[PDB]
Design a protein around this ligand. Sequence first.
Ligand SMILES: Nc1ncnc2c1ncn2[C@@H]1O[C@H](COP(=O)(O)O)[C@@H](O)[C@H]1O
Ligand SMILES: [Ca+2]
Ligand SMILES: [Cl-]
Ligand SMILES: [Cl-]
Lengths: 116, 731
Amino acid sequence: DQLTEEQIAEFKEAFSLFDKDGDGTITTKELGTVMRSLGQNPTEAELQDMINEVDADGNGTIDFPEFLTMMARKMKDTDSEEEIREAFRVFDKDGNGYISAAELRHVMTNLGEKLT
Amino acid sequence: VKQYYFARRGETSTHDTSLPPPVKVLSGRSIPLKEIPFEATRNELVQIYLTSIDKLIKSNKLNSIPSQQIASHYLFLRSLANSETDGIKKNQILSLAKPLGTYLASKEPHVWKMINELIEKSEYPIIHYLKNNRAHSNFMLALIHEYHKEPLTKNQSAFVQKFRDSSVFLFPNPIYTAWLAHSYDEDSSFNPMFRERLSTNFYHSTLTDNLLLRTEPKEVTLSSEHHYKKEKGPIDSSFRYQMSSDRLLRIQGRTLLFSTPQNDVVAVKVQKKGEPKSTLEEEFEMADYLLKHQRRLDVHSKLPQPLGQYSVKKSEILEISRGSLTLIDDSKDLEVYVYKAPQSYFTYLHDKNQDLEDLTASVKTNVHDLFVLLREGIVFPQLADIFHKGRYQALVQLLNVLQFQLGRIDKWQKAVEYVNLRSSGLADLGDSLPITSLFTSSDFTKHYFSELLTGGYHPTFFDKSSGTANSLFTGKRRLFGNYLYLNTIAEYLLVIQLTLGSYGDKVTRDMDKPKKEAVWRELANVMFTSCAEAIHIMTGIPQSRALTLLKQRANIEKHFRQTQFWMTPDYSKLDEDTLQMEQYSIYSGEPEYEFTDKLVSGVGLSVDGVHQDLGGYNRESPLRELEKLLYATVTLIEGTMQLDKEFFKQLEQVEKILSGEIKTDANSCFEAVAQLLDLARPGCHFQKRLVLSYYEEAKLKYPSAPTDAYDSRFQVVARTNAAITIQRFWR
Ligand SMILES: Nc1ncnc2c1ncn2[C@@H]1O[C@H](COP(=O)(O)O)[C@@H](O)[C@H]1O
Ligand SMILES: [Ca+2]
Ligand SMILES: [Cl-]
Ligand SMILES: [Cl-]
């Protein structure tokens, strides 16, 4: 589809975690908290596309990429390197290979942008 | 379109309502059965432990304890202190823990360094320091027996004699719940198996029991539109099938299979000798309810279409069939349920004609709908006819007093001979049951689980002076619904194992030993996957990780080797010295399965001499890794729910500290946020991201405060989140 499986399950577990009543439907009150955990602190999401009042995971993994294909993804990948850049303007010499070894995945990270 | 459940689950006060009177009648005498409170007895032993630390310090004999055991006392005291709320009672504990710090830093300075890496890692450093063989060392009870030179009360004796195997059984609720769910992580070498003086002790069932006794009684509320609440109209059987003898394909038990131009099957199920009409009305009305809500529930089965439910003269049924063919009703009128289903709906899930490709996906289909409908509120207690009343209890140690180990499965092949799991998916749906019937004094529960509802007697429980029988078991009356819940989960997964074992035995008979071990290796993998898929449906845990959490507690190699051994008959042709020589390969640390019965040649262990049993006569099942796998499965599910519960209870505190609803200092607010990270699921990142966001917001409410302790443990969460935003952004 248009959303990858790596973050589908991340949405599935977050939804099933805050779906405290197990009904498979989530309320607006908790919905704000699931996104702050998912990485969004929005302003007013009360505008949504639901059936009558609440939304299920079917309504979740559709509403979410609508709010995920908006992000300044470039504004974030830069921020992630700032977490590692000691002084400034120097991302990492060896940490790039290391910090990618065990966070989510590591299989022959193309060693482009080398010391050239 | 919509996808949700018609069941909202919550909590209640007590399940002990309309229960049988808590009384054992022994020889005219009537013996009252009394609850021994878990949490009240737990705190007593901790208070004795704390008072005994004082006697240990005053005795100066700190060197008579191995540093590893002192490191336990210190780390627990440090962990128990941060779990404490008020600063006055918290510092009394820290007062006790400081001499163990000035001793370790002065005399054993390398141990001091190692645990000091743990204290910067977690508010409960003991839960990680006990991720290994150190958890089998009961340091708390060791100190009590050494320095509390005073006999324990009758209750403290019962608690200790029940939870002797580890000290974690004394931890307060958040620490045990966190330690238990973290004992499945990638860095955990904990398996509940200690070896005593040549004896090997398994206490995987004790983990689940110590977890359930701290829980609250669940309660499931079925919606107004649920199959068991909505008033249903009468079955509209406006059409009557025309029973043709030429199109009579076959006769399955009491069901006539009819061919049909569409290459499907029209099946007619006939009234059995004893079944009333309601049993057939139910199968009709459930298939309709499932066909209706198939999309809404994501049911993967190929449900049959119900056609009619009407009466039929027995002369027509008996005359229509003259094939191979006893079980129908007597003479006059046989009530009928007629349905249409694919040809898959009649090949049992254990058909030797199923390649591993088709079998695997048909097993996955069944386990999906099994647990998806379980959340909906539908329970299937008659999937198979398993016996040892006489029915088989999958989690037997939790439901009975003695119940030392598991049970002997008598048929294990005739038990699943006509299982209600088909290649198409679920079958026989009439034998349904509301999940509420597990949480109430139904005719089901008090008949099959009478001891769990009554209270349990044993001479060791009897108080000669009081005239009553006191036990922790009688505390389960308040919670018995949760026990039968988890037992149902293992019940489902056990029928899958007997089904897979039947399939394995049949296709490996008359067969290349390395090609035969290949079938049994994959069947071990289908069972491990099936259990992991249940954790996903029940907890939202990614199945991939639930499978890794599982493979820390259960050995897929042993399970493959024990199933192949005990589900095939080839071990019958082995002599006594050569049999015990091969059992070492299927256990390899555990004691060999000791048995006395005479081995029936060509079959194996058999009581009736014809059909193989699974275990000696009055002995346990040799499928030991299965017993671990089922207990690991239900402990991950209930243990996750409880961690998430303890997680959310703390998440409120930090929201009331940050929003200003509770006034507290800074270094006591960060303690609230740092403790929330310990209650996050293992491997779950968004939980760790959330408590990172809560932490940054705290450094704005208390910007003047120092962050020496809570720096690195949140930095790694930042580095992990940063490294994911470049890995999850490598599109
Ligand atoms: N009491 C019952 N009522 C309806 N179906 C049952 C019952 N017990 C077992 N079944 C299953 O229903 C299917 C059809 O056979 P029958 O038992 O005659 O209904 C088989 O898969 C049986 O195992
Ligand atoms: Ca809800
Ligand atoms: Cl000691
Ligand atoms: Cl008990």
